[PDB]
Amino acid sequence: TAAVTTAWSEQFPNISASSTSRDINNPVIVDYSLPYFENNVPKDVGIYD
Amino acid sequence: FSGAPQPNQHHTLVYGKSYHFTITNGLPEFRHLATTNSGYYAQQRFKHI
């Protein structure tokens, strides 16, 4: 209603990563199902393979 | 006899300079600008460009 000029601000509530560097965190999770009472389980994934 | 006027003058100038400037980083910032005649603009300044 009052289209007045505002002050400069670096505080972008959520600026796109297409305009600047932005932190993201999406760790991959490996599941090892245990459907039975006594399950057959493998050794942890050897990520280096 | 066959007369003819003098030519127009055509000069070519060549100039040049060299400078040493320094610039720095800057996070992006935004604001809204209001101007006379009800002008309204959304502005985004890249302090690193």
Automatic annotation (TrEMBL), chain A:
**Residue ranges of coiled coil:** none
Subcellular locations according to the entry = Host cell; Virion
Q: What is this protein called?
A: Capsid protein VP
Organism expressing this protein natively: Bombyx mori densovirus 1
Report which part of the complete sequence is shown.
Answer: 377 to 425 of 672
